Design an enzyme around this catalytic site. Sequence first.
Site, PDB file in Angstrom:
ATOM      1  N   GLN B  11       0.823  -1.209   0.000  1.00  0.00           N
ATOM      2  CA  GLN B  11       0.000   0.000   0.000  1.00  0.00           C
ATOM      3  C   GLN B  11       0.856   1.257   0.000  1.00  0.00           C
ATOM      4  OE1 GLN B  11      -2.806   0.231   3.225  1.00  0.00           O
ATOM      5  NE2 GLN B  11      -3.978   1.875   2.247  1.00  0.00           N
ATOM      6  N   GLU B  71      -4.296  -6.714  -1.761  1.00  0.00           N
ATOM      7  CA  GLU B  71      -5.664  -6.341  -1.441  1.00  0.00           C
ATOM      8  C   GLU B  71      -6.339  -5.698  -2.646  1.00  0.00           C
ATOM      9  OE1 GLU B  71      -5.286  -2.710   1.466  1.00  0.00           O
ATOM     10  OE2 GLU B  71      -3.324  -3.646   1.163  1.00  0.00           O
ATOM     11  N   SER B 140       7.162  -0.978   1.894  1.00  0.00           N
ATOM     12  CA  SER B 140       7.254  -0.664   3.310  1.00  0.00           C
ATOM     13  C   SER B 140       7.645  -1.914   4.078  1.00  0.00           C
ATOM     14  CB  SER B 140       5.931  -0.127   3.850  1.00  0.00           C
ATOM     15  OG  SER B 140       4.843  -0.904   3.385  1.00  0.00           O
ATOM     16  N   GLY B 144       3.253  -7.325   5.491  1.00  0.00           N
ATOM     17  CA  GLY B 144       2.202  -7.687   4.566  1.00  0.00           C
ATOM     18  C   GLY B 144       2.682  -7.839   3.139  1.00  0.00           C
ATOM     19  N   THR B 145       1.988  -7.177   2.211  1.00  0.00           N
ATOM     20  CA  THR B 145       2.380  -7.219   0.805  1.00  0.00           C
ATOM     21  C   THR B 145       3.733  -6.557   0.590  1.00  0.00           C
ATOM     22  OG1 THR B 145       0.030  -7.120   0.235  1.00  0.00           O
ATOM     23  CG2 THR B 145       1.614  -6.708  -1.530  1.00  0.00           C
ATOM     24  N   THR B 179       2.715   1.777  13.587  1.00  0.00           N
ATOM     25  CA  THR B 179       1.328   1.410  13.332  1.00  0.00           C
ATOM     26  C   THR B 179       0.983   0.003  13.797  1.00  0.00           C
ATOM     27  OG1 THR B 179       1.116   2.934  11.460  1.00  0.00           O
ATOM     28  CG2 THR B 179      -0.389   1.062  11.532  1.00  0.00           C
ATOM     29  N   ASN B 206       8.716   7.455   9.202  1.00  0.00           N
ATOM     30  CA  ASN B 206       7.619   8.410   9.164  1.00  0.00           C
ATOM     31  C   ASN B 206       7.829   9.590  10.108  1.00  0.00           C
ATOM     32  OD1 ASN B 206       5.847   5.636   8.377  1.00  0.00           O
ATOM     33  ND2 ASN B 206       5.291   7.527   7.310  1.00  0.00           N
ATOM     34  N   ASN B 228       4.401  11.502   0.433  1.00  0.00           N
ATOM     35  CA  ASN B 228       4.585  10.874  -0.867  1.00  0.00           C
ATOM     36  C   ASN B 228       5.101  11.862  -1.905  1.00  0.00           C
ATOM     37  OD1 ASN B 228       3.608   8.670   0.449  1.00  0.00           O
ATOM     38  ND2 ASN B 228       1.725   8.492  -0.751  1.00  0.00           N
ATOM     39  N   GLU B 254      26.835   4.562 -11.410  1.00  0.00           N
ATOM     40  CA  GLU B 254      27.735   5.595 -10.910  1.00  0.00           C
ATOM     41  C   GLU B 254      27.514   5.868  -9.428  1.00  0.00           C
ATOM     42  OE1 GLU B 254      27.001   5.446 -14.112  1.00  0.00           O
ATOM     43  OE2 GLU B 254      27.918   7.056 -15.284  1.00  0.00           O
TER      44      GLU B 254
HETATM   45  N1  LIG Z   1       5.018   7.381   3.717  1.00  0.00           N
HETATM   46  C1  LIG Z   1       3.968   6.572   3.620  1.00  0.00           C
HETATM   47  N2  LIG Z   1       3.925   5.407   4.356  1.00  0.00           N
HETATM   48  C2  LIG Z   1       2.857   4.581   4.263  1.00  0.00           C
HETATM   49  C3  LIG Z   1       1.803   4.897   3.421  1.00  0.00           C
HETATM   50  N3  LIG Z   1       0.883   3.916   3.517  1.00  0.00           N
HETATM   51  C4  LIG Z   1       1.331   2.987   4.389  1.00  0.00           C
HETATM   52  N4  LIG Z   1       2.548   3.389   4.866  1.00  0.00           N
HETATM   53  C5  LIG Z   1       3.382   2.651   5.829  1.00  0.00           C
HETATM   54  O1  LIG Z   1       2.967   1.301   5.851  1.00  0.00           O
HETATM   55  C6  LIG Z   1       2.859   0.814   7.170  1.00  0.00           C
HETATM   56  C7  LIG Z   1       1.669  -0.134   7.283  1.00  0.00           C
HETATM   57  O2  LIG Z   1       1.807  -1.243   6.421  1.00  0.00           O
HETATM   58  P1  LIG Z   1       1.164  -1.234   4.945  1.00  0.00           P
HETATM   59  O3  LIG Z   1       2.136  -0.686   3.930  1.00  0.00           O
HETATM   60  O4  LIG Z   1      -0.107  -0.421   4.962  1.00  0.00           O
HETATM   61  O5  LIG Z   1       0.812  -2.774   4.638  1.00  0.00           O
HETATM   62  P2  LIG Z   1       1.172  -3.437   3.217  1.00  0.00           P
HETATM   63  O6  LIG Z   1       2.648  -3.317   2.924  1.00  0.00           O
HETATM   64  O7  LIG Z   1       0.350  -2.816   2.118  1.00  0.00           O
HETATM   65  O8  LIG Z   1       0.764  -4.984   3.366  1.00  0.00           O
HETATM   66  P3  LIG Z   1      -0.704  -5.408   3.862  1.00  0.00           P
HETATM   67  O9  LIG Z   1      -0.645  -5.795   5.318  1.00  0.00           O
HETATM   68  O10 LIG Z   1      -1.186  -6.591   3.061  1.00  0.00           O
HETATM   69  O11 LIG Z   1      -1.644  -4.242   3.686  1.00  0.00           O
HETATM   70  C8  LIG Z   1       2.691   2.032   8.058  1.00  0.00           C
HETATM   71  O12 LIG Z   1       3.472   1.901   9.221  1.00  0.00           O
HETATM   72  C9  LIG Z   1       3.184   3.200   7.231  1.00  0.00           C
HETATM   73  O13 LIG Z   1       4.408   3.670   7.740  1.00  0.00           O
HETATM   74  C10 LIG Z   1       1.839   6.066   2.678  1.00  0.00           C
HETATM   75  O14 LIG Z   1       0.905   6.351   1.933  1.00  0.00           O
HETATM   76  N5  LIG Z   1       2.927   6.904   2.779  1.00  0.00           N
HETATM   77 MG   LIG Z   2      -1.776  -2.736   2.260  1.00  0.00          MG
END
Ligand SMILES: Nc1nc2c(ncn2[C@@H]2O[C@H](COP(=O)(O)OP(=O)(O)OP(=O)(O)O)[C@@H](O)[C@H]2O)c(=O)[nH]1
Ligand SMILES: [Mg+2]
Lengths: 437, 437, 431, 431, 96, 50, 39
Positions: B11, B71, B140, B144-145, B179, B206, B228, B254
């Site tokens: 995500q 998802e 991230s 998860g994903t 989170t 973050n 973002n 480089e």
């Molecule tokens: N900078 C930034 N960080 C994000 C954003 N969305 C989610 N994150 C980071 O992602 C973490 C939560 O995990 P997700 O990325 O939502 O989960 P995922 O990698 O999509 O995997 P899933 O569990 O299947 O949803 C949070 O702690 C955020 O720091 C975003 O839009 N911008």
């Molecule tokens: Mg996600």
Amino acid sequence: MRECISIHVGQAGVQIGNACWELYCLEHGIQPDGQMPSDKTIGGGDDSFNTFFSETGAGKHVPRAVFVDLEPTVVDEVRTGTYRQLFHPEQLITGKEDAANNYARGHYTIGKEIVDLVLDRIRKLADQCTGLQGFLIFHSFGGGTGSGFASLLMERLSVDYGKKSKLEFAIYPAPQISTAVVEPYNTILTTHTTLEHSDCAFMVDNEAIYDICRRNLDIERPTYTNLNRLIAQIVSSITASLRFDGALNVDLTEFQTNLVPYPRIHFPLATYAPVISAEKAYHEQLSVAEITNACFEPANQMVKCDPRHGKYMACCMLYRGDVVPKDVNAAIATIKTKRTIQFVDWCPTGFKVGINYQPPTVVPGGDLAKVQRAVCMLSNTTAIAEAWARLDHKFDLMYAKRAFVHWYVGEGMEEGEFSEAREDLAALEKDYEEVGV
Amino acid sequence: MRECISIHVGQAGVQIGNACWELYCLEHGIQPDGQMPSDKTIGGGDDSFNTFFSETGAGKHVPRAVFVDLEPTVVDEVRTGTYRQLFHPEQLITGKEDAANNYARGHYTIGKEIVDLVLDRIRKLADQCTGLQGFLIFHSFGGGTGSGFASLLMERLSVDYGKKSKLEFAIYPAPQISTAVVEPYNTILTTHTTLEHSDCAFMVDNEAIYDICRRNLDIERPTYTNLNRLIAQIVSSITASLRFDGALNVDLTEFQTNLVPYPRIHFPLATYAPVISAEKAYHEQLSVAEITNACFEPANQMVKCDPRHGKYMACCMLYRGDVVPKDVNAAIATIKTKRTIQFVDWCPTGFKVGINYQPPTVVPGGDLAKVQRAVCMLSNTTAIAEAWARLDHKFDLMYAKRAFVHWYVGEGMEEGEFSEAREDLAALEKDYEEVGV
Amino acid sequence: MREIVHMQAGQCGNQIGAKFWEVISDEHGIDPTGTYHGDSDLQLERINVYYNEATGGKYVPRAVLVDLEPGTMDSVRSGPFGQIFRPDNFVFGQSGAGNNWAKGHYTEGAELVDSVLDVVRKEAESCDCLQGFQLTHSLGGGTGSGMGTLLISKIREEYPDRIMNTFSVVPSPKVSDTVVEPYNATLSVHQLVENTDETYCIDNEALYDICFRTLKLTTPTYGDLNHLVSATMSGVTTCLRFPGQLNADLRKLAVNMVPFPRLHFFMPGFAPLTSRGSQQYRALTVPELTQQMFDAKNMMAACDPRHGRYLTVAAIFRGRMSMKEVDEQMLNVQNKNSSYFVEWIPNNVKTAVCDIPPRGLKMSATFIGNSTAIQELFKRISEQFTAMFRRKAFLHWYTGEGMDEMEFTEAESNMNDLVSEYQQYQDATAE
Amino acid sequence: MREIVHMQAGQCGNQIGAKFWEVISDEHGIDPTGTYHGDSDLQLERINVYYNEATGGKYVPRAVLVDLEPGTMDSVRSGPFGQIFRPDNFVFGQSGAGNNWAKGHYTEGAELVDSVLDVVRKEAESCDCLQGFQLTHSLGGGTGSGMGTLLISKIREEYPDRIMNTFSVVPSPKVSDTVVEPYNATLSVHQLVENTDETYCIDNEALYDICFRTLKLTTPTYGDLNHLVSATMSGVTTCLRFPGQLNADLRKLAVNMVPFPRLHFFMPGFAPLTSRGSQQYRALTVPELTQQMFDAKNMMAACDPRHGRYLTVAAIFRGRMSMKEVDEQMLNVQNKNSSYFVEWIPNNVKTAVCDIPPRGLKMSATFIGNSTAIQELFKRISEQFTAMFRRKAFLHWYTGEGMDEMEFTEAESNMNDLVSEYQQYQDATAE
Amino acid sequence: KMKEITYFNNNKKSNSTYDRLFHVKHGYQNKLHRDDREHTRGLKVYEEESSKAVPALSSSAYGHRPPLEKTTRKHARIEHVMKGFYRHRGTNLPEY
Amino acid sequence: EEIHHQYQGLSVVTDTAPKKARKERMEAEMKQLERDIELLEKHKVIYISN
Amino acid sequence: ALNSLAPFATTYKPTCGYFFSRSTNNKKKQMGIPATDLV
Ligand SMILES: Nc1nc2c(ncn2[C@@H]2O[C@H](COP(=O)(O)OP(=O)(O)OP(=O)(O)O)[C@@H](O)[C@H]2O)c(=O)[nH]1
Ligand SMILES: [Mg+2]
Ligand SMILES: Nc1nc2c(ncn2[C@@H]2O[C@H](COP(=O)(O)OP(=O)(O)OP(=O)(O)O)[C@@H](O)[C@H]2O)c(=O)[nH]1
Ligand SMILES: Nc1nc2c(ncn2[C@@H]2O[C@H](COP(=O)(O)OP(=O)(O)O)[C@@H](O)[C@H]2O)c(=O)[nH]1
Ligand SMILES: Nc1nc2c(ncn2[C@@H]2O[C@H](COP(=O)(O)OP(=O)(O)O)[C@@H](O)[C@H]2O)c(=O)[nH]1
Ligand SMILES: [Mg+2]
């Protein structure tokens, strides 16, 4: 090239700088929004303002002052009023809660959590500078932000920047009149710090400016506005030789190496002349001889002390206007051959004259008249020992019953700092006696 | 023609790419429907858009983006948003259910059903490129994903392609703000696998970028959108050398041959810091020297670890815009004379300069004031071990009671993976210590 | 495309599910007839999660109404948003048997279990991904407890992978409200522990306290209590139904919240709950929502969280807000009540921001938390259970429907083990 | 930004606070509804010092009205400018202490204090600076005295770094107005002089005197008295709200007016005060204001100050004026009546000039003074306390409801210790 | 009516409670640190204190008057050495 | 606004039967008014049938 | 809308409180569906 950083600490320093930057903008032509009406086409090189302002890109000049205070109020109407755009938004550093006339609270509490930000702003300004030579710490000895935090910033600037001329402009308590009841404590505690860290600290009280406004200016209703405009005129006449040409140009280095005999006697007195109004200016021959006489008069001193009881060591004449050096020589000869004006024996040559060509600039809505001649007489006399003895008597009256000590004690500063400050000013008074005999 | 293919997984990666392709289309003059207007082309056969957009010939351009999330959501927002006709419908891949903050579900159970499809799409979009600079993975480490399936993709890409540059951009968990509760587990499991497969891991947390948005860009209630856009500006400034020309250009090999001394030391930190808002950029001259030494302070690094607690190892400074190649060297000389930062003894020359001519592009809808100079400094530093120590302390402190272990166990993963990841991170910390000393 | 099958069993479960299908019907724009009478397009992207499409634009809920008797089935069918249910998903008996877990579980409750299991099976194969099952029932009844946990066991046996949660109206510490409640609650949790992985314990005087010291509301009634329950029904699956900045579905808020398998008893809540009088006097901001969350005057379980430590906490927000403000508020409340948190896991709070708020609210919130303070309810139920069982009171109505004292001893041992491990994981230090 | 939380206790506190929130909200422009029918953004820049504004234009205050019996709260809500107050912060008891310090401090006044501190903590953590706490209680009653001092003790215990100003009405030299008033006042001041950083000591002969023979008024009602109290109550905190010249915050006044910690009892003064017939014969200028300040009649504490010496004096001017005027007038007062000033304190006068005067005044003047003449109040109260305690007056209530004779003994100990400290710092010379 | 400061405002519209509460705005601006403390930036005094003939603040008297003099441009330190001996671009060395 | 102003001026507690009924009657009246003008304000056309 | 949340209306039949009127008929309604009957 010849930069100079202005640092306004406390309410009095911020208001003095609020007058001072109005005078500087009116002097150099920068409008209140920061935009010069002209540009790089006319005016030639156009580098007169570089002591204070710095042109940024498209042509907006931002000054080199930091308005730092622990209470939000006065710096918020600085941020909100006419000069809202001209100052950099992070230069106008605010505090969170006021020190509220307490050296202990300004030096052992929330002054710590503003000092890193103000120091980083000072470093940003000095790295923007390209030949910085001096500081302009404007503050008050009344207490609180202007005493404890100013002393803390002075100590940190001294240990950070090494050798640098740190001019200080301090608001001193008058003999009969002052506002707070802890002003004696605050003055002794701030003099213990500024004695060994400042370099040519100029001292001004309110009573003498009130008397000058009532006598010379015909102002039946003087106020802090007129006081700060007069102090602004003083500092403009001090720093005018940096920005405008003249017969003799005096900068901060040859200022402080001529006004400081020993590395403890660095508390000169500033007198401006004339401080006349327009009505009395019409009926007169305002000229070099009589403005020197007005400078050396005891009624035009801006510290409430008698210079005739003094033992004048060295003074600098700062002439401003179309001033003839022959007339300067004649006026200095008459002042030297006068006998009530007493000089010390070891300095017969104690008359450092410096003439600038640019006449003084009047402020609209002001009180001073337009004059073709002005002198910012700056004298290192021995009559300031009267002020030291007065404030030491006030401190003794405070300290006999130990009144108003429990606030400092419960804040955290001990009895040892009071004792050290008292013995430090006792040694300072014996130093004036030793140099005066 | 110097193509680089971007895989945005998770995500966070999908949202970051949603900002990134907005910025890329704005830089290259591509309308959201996918076409360049005839009055927004360089003309004469320009090629400074093929590094991110191919050209299915109708006047339409389609990005080289491999947007993937397990998802159904967020990718549906991409499909139904204003950037709908830009992407091909087969480039936006979705799965059955999200891995839901579980490395085991992301790596062994859910991701296996879609790993072949995403590998096929990567193969097609790579074969469509005449010459591939490399891979830009965006994810991230929260879980998860973006963690398990990202690790699976990196394993499969190292199996298939090999030797190609694989820059990853990982949203690292901050020390105090976080989170999920299994984020230490997910980071410990990912950094065992991305250690042996990646070659440069740009990690961002973050809290630090919240502080950047609050302090420098004066948005003290920012959001993931603003984060973002700033990360998009970082990646545009790093990929701005496969496009618009200038002075010294730094490409995908480089800034990797001069950023990693040893193979498993590929964990640098990024800093883009002409981040000045619109009302604060007018009151400042944004110069090369001051942005250069502004991109070295702990208040501007976007990883919550001060660089003072660690020795610098390498720095690749990527300027952008109207920058003369003299004051770059002057500012680097001043930084070399500075004693605040500390370089390692075996790297005497440790600066690599890239310079372009294209000024940074402003997005309408962000604060991000119009500046003619930018720095995108990337430093490999030994101070990144603080984050490893913090998350290792969190990992052991959680693993003492073996909490949240059964979710990983009853999915296709065993506790030997936990033990070997603990051992691998202990070895990584020891290697950083040995390299630093 | 995730999918939830709703299963309302018992009187309390039927009434709560009726108000839940009331509160999400106007959220998704569904009229009582079945059409979409709404404005926003965002309600027809994940409307398949709760309603499946039917002949001629009609959407019908994916819900099963389960009982041993008519009664509140007549009430649900006659009330508004009642002629929206499919008339075939209406498994009900005719005995009137109630307040007997034996008669609901090892008697006629096992007669209709095949029919209701086939109905739920047809509901499940009407889906394509089937995220999980959501059941509403009361702990302390006959039909919702016995037949309910029987269906829980059968669903866990037949689909042992999908997320399945119960909303578990628990017995009441103040007063009793039904004489055989400790027996029913003991025998029901003894089946809930090994099967369910998300039990939202909802208590009655906690809701009375909320409705009277929070919304004034001199005539509270079960309408207001069921709307309080339905708010935290919608607040868990708002992330599945609507997009958001950081989505989190049922499996994510299960894995993020269950450290060990028998640690899945949550304490739901809702924000912002304000009175009619103190509505213009209140600012609807994130710090107010967070303090109203973490105040103990929002919990739907009558146990007080100050005597225990929260294991893990979730704060599912709805509406347009600032991410930094939201997670800074959770950081501030964690660092403030650091003593009211377990120290053997760091950052035991979870954020899930959804971009769509409910009707008439700028922002809303849903607090759901696994805490160690829930053990007081189990200690009370175990003490009442052993007080009745030590003199064999009311036991012959259970042993005459095919039971033995061995099952009661097994349930009591399970209660004592669960209470003991709650004690262990509340006094277990870091190191 | 320096928020101060305002508090009313008792009927005296409720009425004085109601008129104070009339006066300061009229100063800042708030209408009866609560919105902003003001005149300038100068009134809005620091309007959140007293008001927790909601979304939009709602400007409700940070006032906590507390009592043991609802009563005066219904009176305030029925009265003008009463709907501005938030319905949440009307915590009260049910019985009513009345004039019993035991009933305010140990009995059912002491079980309300948990909810009272709950509201105080809510309003304190819904801030960012928290300069201090205003209390307008009654010194010499029940719920005004006992609950007020208990609340002061709790607030000073839980925030021991904040300005604490209590205004208080003094027991009367003439009349009685309450028979158990010396007992109540002694028990209140015993707990008052450890925690309050400043007590203001308003008196109910001076309020009648300076409206009967300074404001004429014939029958002077009671609203005029409350307005006259609220005038200086608003005038003290003018530096915290409105900008201008040389300022003095609450901590600045505290450090300027308290030489030793148990010397913080001051006397107030408002000095634009012209009779209704002779308003036009007076020239309102700073010398006239200073003449009205340093005058024995105008002080609102009784204590004819020719019977002692001012330890410290602070004067808050409000208007467009000169600094030379105010500073020279204070010089003239000091150098003229140096015999009635403390000789070992040079410059015993603090000045503070704001440029925003209140409604209906071009210029305004607020006096506050720590004097060695306020010991007459405490001396009379100690004399009356000893006269009743020798013959064992109304005491069985206190002893059978939860006090001891020993508590009265340390109360009298602090009584005569305080008057001894005033006398000892009065009669001492410079050397 | 005339009051201490004039400010003839046009009743500054209305703030009806129904429109204030039940007209829900999802329009928070991120320039603040909390939504309630709204009046910390939107402050409008800088032009009305200039429209004053005589201003209501002592601090707002520094520059209220229009400038009077021509600033006397004749004597200024015009830099000719280190700003005139240095010319930005071009080695002499003709290239045509 | 009128019923809201009248409802805001009630006693601090409604313990008697007329106080309890007068709270609820005004609450029901004002929320019925809220529903009425919510239906009016959500829409722009409003046709009248018969 | 009949189930608002912010000014909290959970509209049910006019029973209890002030609006009880010996009306709003409490006789049960005909179900229509007979039973679940495999027998
Ligand atoms: N900078 C930034 N960080 C994000 C954003 N969305 C989610 N994150 C980071 O992602 C973490 C939560 O995990 P997700 O990325 O939502 O989960 P995922 O990698 O999509 O995997 P899933 O569990 O299947 O949803 C949070 O702690 C955020 O720091 C975003 O839009 N911008
Ligand atoms: Mg996600
Ligand atoms: N000349 C001049 N002096 C001023 C002015 N304003 C204040 N002062 C002096 O300041 C003294 C009072 O102390 P302040 O300077 O206000 O104290 P501070 O530096 O603001 O620090 P705090 O007390 O903590 O607020 C008075 O005695 C005045 O003499 C001014 O506008 N002009
Ligand atoms: N919130 C709510 N709770 C209810 C309602 N009806 C019954 N209950 C609760 O259900 C419990 C009794 O369980 P019961 O409904 O008799 O179970 P059943 O016999 O299996 O249907 C009591 O403790 C009530 O608190 C209702 O309409 N709303
Ligand atoms: N200004 C004012 N003073 C009051 C009022 N009521 C009592 N007092 C003063 O307070 C003292 C007694 O207070 P009391 O009525 O017992 O306060 P209580 O404790 O709340 O009941 C008397 O000396 C009165 O002078 C009032 O309504 N207004
Ligand atoms: Mg000050």
